[PDB]
Amino acid sequence: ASNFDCCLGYTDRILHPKFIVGFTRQLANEGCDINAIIFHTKKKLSVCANPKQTWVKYIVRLLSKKVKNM
């Protein structure tokens, strides 16, 4: 069965690293039937980030590339 079921209702904002301290990606083949990026705000709220939007694509690129430089 599906472990979890990703957020079926997304958001329409431009959230930033400015507000993000966490991130959980949801695919349509791991459990959910749809795919939603979960950006965890510094406000303890899970944002249903649309995989459709570039600000999301941008943040998820950085969130996948946490290379330890500093």
Tab-separated table of C-alpha atoms in Angstrom:
chain	number	residue	atom	x	y	z
A	1	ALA	CA	0.000	0.000	0.000
A	2	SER	CA	0.933	3.677	-0.025
A	3	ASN	CA	2.978	4.744	3.002
A	4	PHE	CA	1.670	8.293	2.926
A	5	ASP	CA	-0.492	10.476	0.704
A	6	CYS	CA	1.092	13.774	-0.326
A	7	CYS	CA	-0.714	17.119	-0.073
A	8	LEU	CA	-3.543	17.097	-2.615
A	9	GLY	CA	-4.023	20.830	-2.321
A	10	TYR	CA	-0.994	22.942	-3.146
A	11	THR	CA	-0.239	26.613	-2.458
A	12	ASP	CA	0.383	29.743	-4.561
A	13	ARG	CA	3.220	31.715	-3.027
A	14	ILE	CA	6.844	32.514	-3.551
A	15	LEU	CA	8.406	31.018	-0.433
A	16	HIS	CA	12.146	31.253	0.001
A	17	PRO	CA	15.117	29.840	1.883
A	18	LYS	CA	14.111	32.903	3.930
A	19	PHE	CA	11.310	30.832	5.469
A	20	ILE	CA	12.439	27.244	4.914
A	21	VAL	CA	14.231	25.083	7.463
A	22	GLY	CA	13.057	21.721	6.195
A	23	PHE	CA	11.982	19.908	3.050
A	24	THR	CA	10.248	16.639	2.222
A	25	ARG	CA	9.675	15.582	-1.380
A	26	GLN	CA	6.576	13.610	-2.356
A	27	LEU	CA	6.459	11.631	-5.578
A	28	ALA	CA	3.558	10.009	-7.415
A	29	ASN	CA	5.204	6.585	-7.339
A	30	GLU	CA	6.423	6.265	-3.746
A	31	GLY	CA	2.989	6.394	-2.185
A	32	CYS	CA	1.063	9.444	-3.281
A	33	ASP	CA	-0.735	9.428	-6.629
A	34	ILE	CA	0.328	13.007	-7.184
A	35	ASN	CA	3.560	14.852	-6.403
A	36	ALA	CA	4.028	17.777	-4.047
A	37	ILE	CA	7.159	19.285	-2.555
A	38	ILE	CA	6.788	19.829	1.187
A	39	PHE	CA	8.746	22.862	2.296
A	40	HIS	CA	8.865	23.025	6.076
A	41	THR	CA	8.685	26.629	7.190
A	42	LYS	CA	10.423	28.145	10.195
A	43	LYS	CA	6.823	28.606	11.301
A	44	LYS	CA	6.419	24.842	11.798
A	45	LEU	CA	3.963	24.634	8.888
A	46	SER	CA	4.268	22.264	5.940
A	47	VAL	CA	3.927	24.140	2.659
A	48	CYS	CA	2.458	22.173	-0.227
A	49	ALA	CA	4.910	23.474	-2.783
A	50	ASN	CA	3.917	23.051	-6.410
A	51	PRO	CA	6.475	21.098	-8.454
A	52	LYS	CA	5.153	23.307	-11.267
A	53	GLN	CA	6.766	26.558	-10.164
A	54	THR	CA	10.367	27.689	-10.596
A	55	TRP	CA	10.843	29.110	-7.092
A	56	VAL	CA	10.076	25.603	-5.898
A	57	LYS	CA	12.418	24.103	-8.475
A	58	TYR	CA	15.087	26.545	-7.322
A	59	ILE	CA	14.741	25.772	-3.615
A	60	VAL	CA	14.500	22.004	-4.196
A	61	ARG	CA	17.734	22.199	-6.242
A	62	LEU	CA	19.516	23.754	-3.279
A	63	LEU	CA	17.818	21.338	-0.886
A	64	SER	CA	19.177	18.456	-2.965
A	65	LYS	CA	22.615	20.069	-3.127
A	66	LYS	CA	23.458	20.677	0.515
A	67	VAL	CA	27.194	20.421	-0.045
A	68	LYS	CA	29.270	21.206	3.025
A	69	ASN	CA	31.333	24.203	1.979
A	70	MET	CA	30.695	26.318	5.057
